[PDB]
DNA sequence: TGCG
DNA sequence: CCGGCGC
DNA sequence: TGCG
DNA sequence: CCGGCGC
DNA sequence: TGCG
DNA sequence: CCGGCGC
DNA sequence: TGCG
DNA sequence: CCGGCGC
């Protein structure tokens, strides 16, 4: 009997090598190693072949794999945290944005003033200069929390009526928008200079938030400790990152025994830096 | 009125006024007001009025006040909070700390590493040069949560074992210590100077923290919308503030007519950076 | 006694003699010194003797104090300062700030679109909600560069003319302002929550700055290696704090055998966070 | 005669024609154009045009043309910044730091302290987990400043000796390293995820340092203000971006007509967040 | 080369 | 480090 | 189409 | 968005 | 009159 | 702005 | 205590 | 920690 959380993590890699997200062309290279580095095609070698990778075909265009690591891991953390109604109770909508939202996070309560600066400065110079348009951040996956009743808060006592408690953020109709709950970056692979945008999308949250600040977390693929670190290391704009296949990479790292990247994986994950994708949905019910 | 939230915050009240803390001095001088302050003087008498106030008596000293108006936002939030079991269910812990204690915060998950970093400094000088000292200053008020049996986690379903989400933050077991949800600030009154300590005091929660940013809000008596304004406005290290008594205050500058003090007053309203001290637990809720 | 700068830090400590804001009440207290605590009582005492002050004088008003610092400060700047033209020339200007705080700090290059931001929030609701207010900053002294015209620029080569480098901040042009070189805080006396004043003001000229950023240093006559430490240590807000009698300071720190204090001094001076008043013009013309 | 500085410009542009760093293909598309956009490619070749480029060859590979163009605007800014000696005098070097060489900012005096805190996480695995790695990174071109001897600051008067501003930064006493005077970040051309690193670079020197901040800019030779405006706009990281050609990109923008795009260039140029690369050198002496 |  | 290009 |  | 690969 |  | 002193 |  | 009050 394996538990549901290990059903849904096998259910997350069989679409991965479904949809040929991870496979291996014919020349033996894995769709997220780096070809040019032999401890990079080794290691995502060794994984493939832990998540019984069988599939040869071509490694899919950058766009593509982007795009489908994205719905996929959407797809996960939505069908896992489901199951934690008991220990993070709420209306939960987890949905993968795309490029395509301009301002979607304005839409939230925490960034809903974004909306009247980006209107404000559509009128002024020195406003746009000194404001940026970064404000306009855009993750790639949301997490929210619908608005409840008073008859939700109420449930089991009579404890707020329309004269108390007249701005909490969870009452709706306020004229009061959905919570954002998290800000989930994906990342397929890692190169560490791209990586760097989590950082600064992660400090705009901080930054212009009015509220509690959603959780910031990063998924990967990366199979190299020392990409991985680029973004891992480090504290104040990423809450953790979570690897897409973790106990396989750390299975490798020590059957291979490739000592100095096994030393950066311990001091990621014993330092609280990184997990499994499977510690996700558990860590968004803290 | 009858809803339990509003008959705590007028506990709350009670307590203040039956304590001595808040009351009026023989010269009229209402003991959360700045004597010298013509509108802070006659703001605080107005809120006094609406508390019902009556006991005349001396200022208690700042230190005791300070510390009073702590412990009561403290038994106030716990009371409160207590009541919203359905809408945030877990083992929580309401109390009130500052200076009984320094680095209380590395006893907590999230800052478990600032005692790794205070023995580090502590062997080696400059380190402490560099690292500074400050990331061990205590909240006034902590709010924390107790770590999760498998039991409750699969108390529906068998979710998870001891393959599977090892390194889930709720999850009790590996010397793993409990969450810190809030940092709670409290000032009495305000000066513009002396309240930026909340500030910095956010700074570093945001700085050093390994997973999801706790709450970090402050809670103050100060009459004067100004010296409110000197921590409500801005955003990125304080989520909110919260007044004593915000209907009051609202209810007063009315009918004193001090436009000025009126429209900064909604500005910190409408602007989602002030709220009143009952929309608090709701708002640890999210 | 002979090198100039050691005469003009001689002077600046006569100026608080003279001035009485350095003296000894007649409970023996010294007027920088917090006379409830034993070791800032013999600290301060200590250094006094080392100034050779003599003067007895009741304790100043804090507010008289802290202008008095400031005024004093500046002028030991702008003297020691004007004789470092031949390592870093340029027309300078030092001055106490004062009451017409606000804004003062938008007549700067680097700081000038804080006034639109201002005007904008004037005419409109809540901006003023997100942008805050703080930033209207308001240093307790200022040093700033005056333009440099063509002909300056031009003095050995023709290196420009009307078509080139036509943005160059440097440059004197109807639109042009000064640009702000310093911003030196001054604190008679520290208490650990005041201080942080300090370190809010330099984050704000931190994130809204357009150009190089000001050096920002705090000058202090605190007495005491803790307090002096609230603000000292650590980075990322100030550049560095001096002290009123660093060498006096150490002095007696070695003669009285409080060797905590004594440990707390060399990590900060060895830590490069606390120097002495008469390194100040210097690491001015950086 | 023509000025210097637009010698020094014109010297610039040749070093970018004659390496083929700035060429046209045989399709058409200039070598800092985005071939798929239509905006991109027509752009580029206005500014190719202005800039006289005849050649036709094949783009270079973008590790060719990314260090090409770091070292060219090291020469560039090398030989003009050595003409204003009587505007900023000093001993500076400029130079084009390889990636080959993690830890070199440490050689400078405001950094030093980061070769401690690298050795402490050697020994203290973990501690690396909350201090990161990237700290050590070093920017694409540095300008320093040697230390003066007292010789110079004695110049003209009698100002220190060895008991006096004993901390100095500038003197060459404390086994004081040289300072560092500037981080040049370069972008041949950009997409704005890997934009983002100039970003996190530049905090991590505002968030280490003891001293004062260096300059923190950023050269680019990307022909689109949209791919432009994420790094220039927005402030706290980046003191000012420099185009390689602007005046070339106001004139080809304001002859296609593309209204959007010239809003956004003024927006960055009028905002100062955007300006020459003519103005960098002069900038580089406030 | 490795990785920016 | 930059370039290509699919969503 | 343009752009993450 | 990711992938290739030269300094 | 009220910030610092 | 700084000072006093109960915590 | 000295400090928050 | 807050209170007093000069500038
Ligand atoms: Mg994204
Ligand atoms: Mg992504
Ligand atoms: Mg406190
Ligand atoms: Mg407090
Ligand atoms: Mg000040
Ligand atoms: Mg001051
Ligand atoms: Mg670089
Ligand atoms: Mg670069």
Redesign the pocket.
């Known amino acids: 009997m394996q538990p549901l959380f290990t059903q849904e993590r096998r259910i997350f890699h069989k679409k991965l090598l479904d949809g040929n997200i991870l496979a291996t062309n014919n020349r033996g290279?894995v769709?997220?190693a780096?070809?040019?580095?032999?401890?990079s095609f080794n290691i995502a070698k060794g994984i493939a072949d832990l998540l019984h990778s069988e599939t040869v075909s071509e490694?899919l265009?950058?766009?593509?794999?982007?795009?489908?690591?994205?719905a996929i891991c959407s797809e996960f953390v939505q069908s896992a945290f489901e199951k934690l109604q008991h220990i993070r109770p709420g209306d939960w909508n987890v949905k993968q944005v795309?490029?395509r939202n301009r301002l979607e996070i304005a839409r939230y309560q925490q960034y809903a003033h974004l909306t009247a600066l980006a209107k404000a400065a559509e009128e002024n110079p020195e406003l746009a200069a000194a404001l940026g348009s970064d404000y306009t951040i855009?993750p790639?996956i949301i997490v929210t929390r619908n608005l409840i009743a008073d008859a939700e808060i109420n449930r089991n006592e009579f404890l707020v009526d329309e004269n108390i408690a007249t701005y909490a953020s969870l009452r709706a109709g306020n004229g009061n928008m959905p919570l954002l709950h998290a800000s989930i970056?994906?990342?397929?692979?890692i190169?560490?200079?791209?990586a760097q945008?989590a950082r600064s999308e992660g400090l705009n949250l901080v930054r212009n938030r009015k509220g509690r600040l959603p959780h910031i977390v990063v998924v990967t693929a990366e199979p190299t400790p020392?990409?991985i670190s680029?973004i891992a290391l480090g504290t104040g704009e990423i809450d953790c990152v979570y690897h897409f296949a973790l106990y396989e990479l750390e299975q490798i790292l020590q059957s291979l025994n490739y000592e100095d990247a096994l030393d950066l994986f311990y001091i990621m994950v014993n330092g609280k830096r990184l997990k499994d994708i499977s510690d996700l949905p558990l860590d968004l019910a803290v």
């Open positions: 290279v769709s997220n780096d070809g040019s580095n032999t401890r490694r265009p950058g766009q593509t794999s982007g795009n489908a690591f994205e795309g490029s855009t790639d970056s994906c990342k397929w692979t190169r560490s200079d791209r945008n020392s990409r680029s």
